[PDB]
Amino acid sequence: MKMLLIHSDYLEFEAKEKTKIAEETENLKGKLDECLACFIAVEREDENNPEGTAIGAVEEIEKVANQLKVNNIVVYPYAHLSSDLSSPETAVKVLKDIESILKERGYNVLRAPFGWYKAFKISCKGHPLSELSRKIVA
Amino acid sequence: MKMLLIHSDYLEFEAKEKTKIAEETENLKGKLDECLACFIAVEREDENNPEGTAIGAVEEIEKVANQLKVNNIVVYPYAHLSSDLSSPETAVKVLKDIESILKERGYNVLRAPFGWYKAFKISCKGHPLSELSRKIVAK
Ligand SMILES: Nc1ncnc2c1ncn2[C@@H]1O[C@H](CO)[C@@H](NC(=O)[C@@H](N)CO)[C@H]1O
Ligand SMILES: Nc1ncnc2c1ncn2[C@@H]1O[C@H](CO)[C@@H](NC(=O)[C@@H](N)CO)[C@H]1O
Ligand SMILES: [Cl-]
Ligand SMILES: [Mg+2]
């Protein structure tokens, strides 16, 4: 799994174009202020252990989110972070689990929909811990 | 080299804090509209051929910019795209070369400062060619 975590003034997105793997969700458009935007590519190795991957990913997000005193999290599928992707069924499973576990831990989570081409706007705060890269190996 | 190309309504940045490897510059704030924002990690393999790498990079930028009818290009140093980075000296050499080559080919380029912490803002247009990853192996 590869993740880029961006401490943002806001993240706004709008689903524009369907792909063959687009999921119809209740958040085709969405916005979250004062948030950690987590851009996530689910990778082929993740298929070995989808559940452990989600757990590892949540541990890293919470480390960052707690250091920054941030409760708003956007889980944003971002397949461009890796050229070794998992299958779509595994990827959906892992993204929804990261969301589900974060909500159980009291975070305010907005999941952007899987399998769409989307427009987005972001403003990255630019302090020393505002942009962080994490590689998760379960 | 790893590149992530994003077709944007705009890209803005402001340098905030100097890292220990910051490039000396006066270009500390900048904005470019209707651009292809090119986030670039220069990798250690690029050390064997910095010239071919910049040429390889520009070739890929050109193919996208021509498809999308874009003339405005941001060259934005982005180490997080790769876990196997080049030296900072090689990275700047390559990024500068990318800019100068694009400039010779008629593109307008904004180059974001290397080794500074920057605030930034981007609006990605959201279509199938609006975000592209490219791996450049130099010829
Ligand atoms: N292994 C994977 N990890 C994360 N995301 C994945 C994926 N496989 C497919 N996707 C999703 O399908 C859209 C098209 O590839 C991807 N779309 C995107 O990454 C958008 N940023 C484009 O605007 C994403 O929703
Ligand atoms: N091989 C390389 N390729 C591209 N950029 C590189 C580099 N080595 C160092 N940098 C730059 O130094 C900052 C601190 O690592 C890097 N900073 C950044 O990538 C910010 N966007 C996130 O901190 C970047 O400016
Ligand atoms: Cl979804
Ligand atoms: Mg738009």
Residue numbers in the entry:
A (entry chain A): 5 to 142
B (entry chain D): 5 to 143
Copy text verbatim from the article accompanying this structure deposition.
To understand this intriguing mechanism of cognate substrate rejection in NTD, we have solved high-resolution crystal structures of ApNTD, as well as NTD from Methanococcus jannaschii (MjNTD) in complex with non-cognate and cognate substrate analogues L-seryl-3′-aminoadenosine (L-Ser3AA) and L-threonyl-3′-aminoadenosine (L-Thr3AA), respectively. In the case of MjNTD, L-Ser3AA and L-Thr3AA complex were crystallized in C2 and P21 space groups with six and four monomers, respectively, in the asymmetric unit corresponding to three and two dimers. However, a clear and complete ligand density was observed in only chain A in the case of MjNTD co-crystals and therefore only this monomer was used for analysis. The possible reason for this could be the remarkably low binding affinity for the ligand in MjNTD, as revealed by binding studies later in this section. L-Ser3AA tightly binds in the active-site pocket in such a way that a conserved hydrogen bond with the main-chain N atom of Lys121 (residue number corresponding to PabNTD) fixes the β-OH group of the substrate in all three NTDs. The carbonyl oxygen of the substrate has a water-mediated interaction with His83 in PabNTD, while the same atom interacts directly with the corresponding His77 in ApNTD and His84 in MjNTD. However, in ApNTD, it has only a water-mediated interaction with the corresponding Glu129, whereas in the case of MjNTD, this group is directly recognized by both Glu135 and His84. Moreover, the catalytic sites in PabNTD and MjNTD accommodate a single water molecule, which is the putative catalytic water Wat1. We also performed biochemical studies with MjNTD against L-Ser-(Ec)tRNAThr and L-(Ec)Thr-tRNAThr to ensure that this enzyme is efficient in non-cognate/cognate discrimination.
We have been interested in a D-aminoacyl-tRNA deacylase (DTD) fold that is present across the domains of life in two different functional contexts: as an N-terminal editing domain (NTD) of archaeal ThrRS, which specifically removes non-cognate L-serine mischarged on tRNAThr, and as a freestanding ‘chiral proofreading' enzyme, which removes D-amino acids from tRNAs in bacteria and eukaryotes. Both share a striking structural and mechanistic similarity highlighting a common ancestry. Here we show, with the help of structural, biochemical and biophysical studies from three distant organisms, that the substrate specificity in this domain is determined by a differential remodelling of the catalytic centre at the RNA–protein interface rather than just the presence or absence of catalytic water as previously proposed. While demonstrating that the tRNA provides the catalytic group, we show that the side chains within the recognition site are dispensable for the proofreading function, suggesting a primordial mode of protein- or peptide scaffold-based enzymatic activity evolved alongside that of RNA.
